[PDB]
Design an enzyme around this catalytic site. Structure first.
Site, PDB file in Angstrom:
ATOM      1  N   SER A  17       0.683  -1.092   0.086  1.00 42.76           N
ATOM      2  CA  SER A  17      -0.047   0.174  -0.084  1.00 42.76           C
ATOM      3  C   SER A  17       0.876   1.086  -0.078  1.00 42.76           C
ATOM      4  CB  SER A  17      -1.084   0.088   1.127  1.00 42.76           C
ATOM      5  N   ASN A  19       0.395   5.909  -1.317  1.00 40.79           N
ATOM      6  CA  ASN A  19      -0.466   7.080  -1.474  1.00 40.79           C
ATOM      7  C   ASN A  19      -1.379   6.956  -3.045  1.00 40.79           C
ATOM      8  N   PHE A  20      -0.742   6.063  -3.986  1.00 44.91           N
ATOM      9  CA  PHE A  20      -1.306   5.625  -5.139  1.00 44.91           C
ATOM     10  C   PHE A  20      -2.608   4.976  -4.746  1.00 44.91           C
ATOM     11  CE2 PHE A  20       2.117   2.940  -4.251  1.00 44.91           C
ATOM     12  CZ  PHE A  20       1.571   1.457  -4.370  1.00 44.91           C
ATOM     13  N   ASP A 124      14.687   6.049  -6.041  1.00 44.25           N
ATOM     14  CA  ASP A 124      13.969   5.411  -5.027  1.00 44.25           C
ATOM     15  C   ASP A 124      14.486   4.023  -4.519  1.00 44.25           C
ATOM     16  OD1 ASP A 124      12.019   5.244  -2.864  1.00 44.25           O
ATOM     17  OD2 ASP A 124      10.234   4.904  -4.169  1.00 44.25           O
TER      18      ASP A 124
END
Ligand code: 0JE
Length: 265
Positions: A17, A19-20, A124
């Protein structure tokens, strides 16, 4: 690139999980392939750009994108890496040998060497974004912040400072918003620390500004328990403040390649 929704079967189990939205387990008819599906105007354009980057990549140490699908929500279909994130796996399996850690870390450097050659910046690179196919097979994932470098530039210039994983970012990223393959080398050093620390979070109990202040003093994270001197020396070489003196992925991969074969034999 465009997949058939009828051939895609989504499971109730959620892998991750953000923000998307969420990442869920699935099945796609080709033989049927087990897949990890990233389920979601800003977020949609971000997913389309992420898919465009992944489609251009062809390396055994990078998560392969199957394609995209537009249905109940925008979907990014990827090949399934069953064992999951490296940080979570090492937290659950503390008895994983030092030789095995070097092996997985070297596989990430091989994938990052290709990414450097392909003129793509990850932005990232962290242990949470390294996914395991097996205990001896690692792949690089999460290309959400990744950028295709301009033909005339060796770096990506960000206009604004967004939701950034600052603890993995090089000083030039924080100070000048400049992201190069050598910036990913700094992140790789932090990734190495995380792997040898068995999925422990870097710079624990510290704020982003406190990390920047620590690195400016010339201070770096200490050697993890059981981590070889040669591996900690590479972490520190990845943590070279000045971009020009910091090694590229070809030099980082070679050092890991030679040390891994020294342990093997
Ligand atoms: C025991 C299974 O655990 C997992 C396996 C997983 N396999 C994946 C996976 N395969 N291919 C892609 C992905 N996931 C991702 O790329 N992400 C974004 C980094 C979700 C972690 N994500 C997983 C998350 C898990 F918790």
């Amino acid at each position: 690139v465009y997949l058939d929704r009828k051939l895609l079967t989504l499971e109730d189990k959620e892998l991750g999980s953000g923000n998307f939205g969420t990442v869920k387990k699935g099945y796609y008819q080709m033989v049927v392939k087990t897949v990890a599906v990233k389920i979601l105007p800003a977020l949609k354009d971000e997913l389309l750009a992420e898919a465009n980057v992944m489609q251009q990549l062809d390396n055994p140490y990078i998560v392969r994108m199957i394609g995209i699908c537009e249905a109940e929500s925008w979907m990014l279909v990827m090949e399934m890496a069953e064992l999951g994130p490296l940080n979570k796996y090492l937290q659950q399996n503390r008895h994983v040998k030092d030789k095995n850690i070097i092996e997985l870390v070297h596989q990430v450097s091989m994938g990052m060497k290709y990414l450097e050659e392909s003129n793509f910046v990850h932005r990232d690179l962290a242990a949470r974004n390294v996914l395991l196919v097996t205990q001896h097979y690692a792949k690089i994932s999460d290309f959400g912040l990744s950028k295709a470098l301009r033909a005339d530039e060796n770096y990506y210039k960000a206009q604004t400072h967004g939701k950034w994983p600052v603890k993995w970012y090089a000083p030039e990223c924080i100070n000048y918003y400049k992201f190069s393959s050598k910036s990913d080398v700094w992140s790789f050093g932090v990734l190495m620390w995380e792997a040898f620390s068995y999925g422990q979070k870097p710079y624990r109990g510290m704020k982003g500004s406190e990390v920047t202040a620590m690195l400016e003093k010339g201070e770096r994270m200490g050697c993890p328990a059981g981590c070889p001197r040669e591996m900690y020396d590479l972490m520190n070489l990845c943590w070279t403040y000045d971009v020009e003196n910091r090694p590229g992925f070809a030099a980082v991969e070679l050092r890991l390649r030679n040390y891994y074969y020294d342990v093997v034999n």
